[PDB]
Amino acid sequence: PFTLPNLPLSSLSNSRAPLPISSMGISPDNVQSVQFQNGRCTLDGRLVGTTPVSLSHVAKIRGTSNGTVINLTELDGTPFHPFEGPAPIGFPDLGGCDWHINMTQFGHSSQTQYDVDTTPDTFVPHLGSIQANGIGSGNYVGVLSWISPPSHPSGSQVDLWKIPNYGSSITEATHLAPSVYPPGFGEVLVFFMSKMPGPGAYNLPCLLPQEYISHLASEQAPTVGEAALLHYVDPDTGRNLGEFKAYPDGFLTCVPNGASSGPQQLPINGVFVFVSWVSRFYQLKPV
Amino acid sequence: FTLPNLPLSSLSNSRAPLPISSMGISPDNVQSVQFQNGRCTLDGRLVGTTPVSLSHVAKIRGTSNGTVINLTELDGTPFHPFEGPAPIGFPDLGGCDWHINMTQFGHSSQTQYDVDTTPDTFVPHLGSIQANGIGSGNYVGVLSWISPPSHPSGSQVDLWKIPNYGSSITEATHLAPSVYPPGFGEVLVFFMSKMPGPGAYNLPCLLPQEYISHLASEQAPTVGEAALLHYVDPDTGRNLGEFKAYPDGFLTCVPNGASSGPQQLPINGVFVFVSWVSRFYQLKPV
Ligand SMILES: CC(=O)N[C@H]1[C@H](O[C@H]2[C@@H](O)[C@@H](CO)O[C@@H](O[C@H]3[C@H](O)[C@@H](O)[C@H](O)O[C@@H]3CO)[C@@H]2O)O[C@H](CO)[C@@H](O)[C@@H]1O[C@@H]1O[C@H](CO)[C@H](O)[C@H](O)[C@H]1O[C@@H]1O[C@@H](C)[C@@H](O)[C@@H](O)[C@@H]1O
Ligand SMILES: [Mg+2]
Ligand SMILES: [Mg+2]
């Protein structure tokens, strides 16, 4: 039968940054669809977007600075070409913020904070090039460390529901993984949340924990139905804490009991368990 | 029984968040190892300071008072000596100085924390390590790069070691037990990664992190004396070598002489469980 990891959510990682999962949640009123490029894996094991199998590749960059630009490669140094995607595998996908990436080197001492505004014309990872912003010549590996409000537009909020502008303009085609929409029926998308360091109470959402991605990529389920009915289970008591659906494209939903009672009010130490394949129209009991 | 159907080169070290770049054997001045991270038995028992998730690997959390950092678990839960040699996920890289990147919830900026693990102030088993200039506050830290140990002065990096978690080398810290080569011409197999810093630093571990989460999820009900495995090229399906996985959570093979061992294998293959065999099942070299 089809399986999800038999691991409690609070033991798992975000798939958009190497951070422990601290809660589940729903999106703000002003967010309907999302278009995350990391943390995208179908139920039959197809990785989508810039998603890697391993957290060791998540929210990382690799490239060589000439003092003006950083020419990007894949994490292992392999060339990256525009046809391959919006950015190299694992490249950070946090829109709506400035990044602070910790840069280190193979064969040299020290780390350097690389400050990334993802809005200027020089930020073109789809074409393999981003501004150096004072990073001296050399080859670096970088990992996202902390975030802050965007440099532009001035006074913008931190909005992690967004993805960055990977192309030379927002109108350049960059081979983005497609958007994910709430499927209707009163079902809402479920997000796995992590606290992100920086000068505010930042919470990073993703569609699946990273360990779900490696699990599904390994499992390569030969049978995927229209929707998987799941129970969110307390491992000790075995109590079913609520019904959820997982959809083939790689996301979970539930029907909240009301505005103040939904997946965010459930304990975070539960385990999602596959129950059965159901119709896409299967109506869930509110959680 | 299953292992991940994933190529090794797609996976992570379990002692630091680094891609796997090769398999290797131990140096000839190392017979046994005692890593505290990357320890999981075949039936899914986490051992030492090993976490389920790479998001906890080689990380620290604690509050500096400017003199010491008082440690907690990564989620802020108290850590007590009876629980182990250090909080879950705490770095286990001996034979080097650490440079840890410290960040804070609710504050800007990062700070490099330089850790000599040799002085008597380095007592993570008792929940305390020297601040070494880290100002007052609560931090989460992740290992960023390493350098040669400050003591003994002039020594080389040696990642086959673990640090001194106790108040002295004689203090009992509830270390996970050592892993020994099991006999029958078999060698311990290590999954290797390259660690940033001023040298060519090679970090070994006993299992990729994704194997840890897989085994911890799977909770195999029927573990035998040893699992016979094949290392397989996925496309071609070719068996590249017979290996054994042992219940305590390590792999072995028999090298084909001094010239040909795990290091000579390509790193894009997949370990596949074949059958349970006896502990003394004799492997074919390679
Ligand atoms: C660039 C920077 O650090 N900006 C942050 C700003 O920093 C000011 C303080 O350091 C202040 C201390 O007295 O000095 C200001 O500089 C003055 C000099 O003092 C003065 O002698 C000289 O004549 O004039 C200059 C002004 O031209 C610094 O600008 O502090 C802010 C409040 O803490 C902080 O929010 C700001 O951080 C940047 O904020 C924008 C949004 O506005 C973006 O999020 C940026 O990403 C963010 O920068 C990032 O964080 C800072 C703390 C630092 O780590 C940067 O490297 C990083 O990119
Ligand atoms: Mg689960
Ligand atoms: Mg494998």
Smallest Cβ–Cβ distance between B54 and the set A7, A18, A220 belongs to A18
**B10 CA from centroid of ligand 3 (Å):** 9
d(CA A257, CA A260): 8
Which tokens belong to A264? 């965010």
Domains of chain B: 1-56+148-286 (2.40.510.10), 57-147 (2.40.30.120)
Determine if ligand 1 sits within 6 Å of the CB of residue A264.
Answer: no
- 99-118 of A, contacting B, C-beta below 8 A: 100, 102, 104-111, 113
Q: Spell out where chain B is interrupted, by the residue before each break (C to N > 2.5 A).
A: none
Residues 149-178 of B with CB under 8 A from A: none
Secondary structure (H, E, C), A205-234:
EECCCHHHHHHHHHHCCCCCCCEEEEEEEC
Q: How many CB atoms lie within 10 A of CB A129?
A: 17
CA distance B18 to chain A (A): 5
A145 to chain B: which residues are within 8 Å by CB?
Answer: 101, 103, 110
Atom of ligand 1 nearest to the CA of A148: 44
Entry resolution (Å): 1.4
Paired with A73 in beta bridges are A79
- Ligand 1 and A133: CB distance under 6 A: no
Which DSSP string corresponds to chain B? -----S-GGGSB-SSSS-B--EEE---TT-S-B--SSS-B-TTS-B-TT--SSGGGTTEEEEEE-SSEEEEE-TTS-B--GGG-SSSTT-----SSEEEEEEE-BTS---EEEEE-S-STT-BGGGTEEE-TTPPSEEEEEEEEEEE--SSSTTPPP-TTS----SSSTTS---PPPPB---STT-EE-EEEEEE-BSS-EEEEESS-HHHHHHHHHH--S---SEEEEEEE-TTT--EEEEEEEETTTEEEE--BTTTBSGGGS-SS-EEEEEEEE-TTPPPPP-
Contact A211 B18 (CB under 8 A): no
Nearest to B5 among A111, A199, A220 (CB): A220
Q: Is the peptide bond before A150 cis (omega within 30 degrees of 0)?
A: no
- Contact (CB, 8 A) for B94 and B87: no
Method: X-ray
Degrees to nearest 5, angle at CA A90 with A84 and A91: 80
CA–CA distance, A200 with A156 (Å, rounded to integer): 13
Q: Structure tokens of A234?
A: 């307390």
- Going by the DSSP 8-state scheme, the letter that residue A84 receives in this structure is G
Closest of B147, B59, B141 to residue B95, by C-alpha = B147
Count the neighbouring beta carbons within 10 Å of the beta carbon of residue A179: 11
User: Which chain B residues are within 8 Å of A105, Cβ to Cβ?
Assistant: 145, 196
Ligand 1 midpoint to CA B272 (Å): 53
Cβ atoms of residues B124 and B165 within 8 Å: yes
How far apart are the C-alpha atoms of A39 and A211, rounded to whole Å? 10
Could you tell me which of B207, B243, B227, B166 has the C-alpha nearest to residue B45? B207
Nearest chain A residue to B57 by CA distance is A18
Nearest Cβ partner for B6 among A56, A148, A217: A217
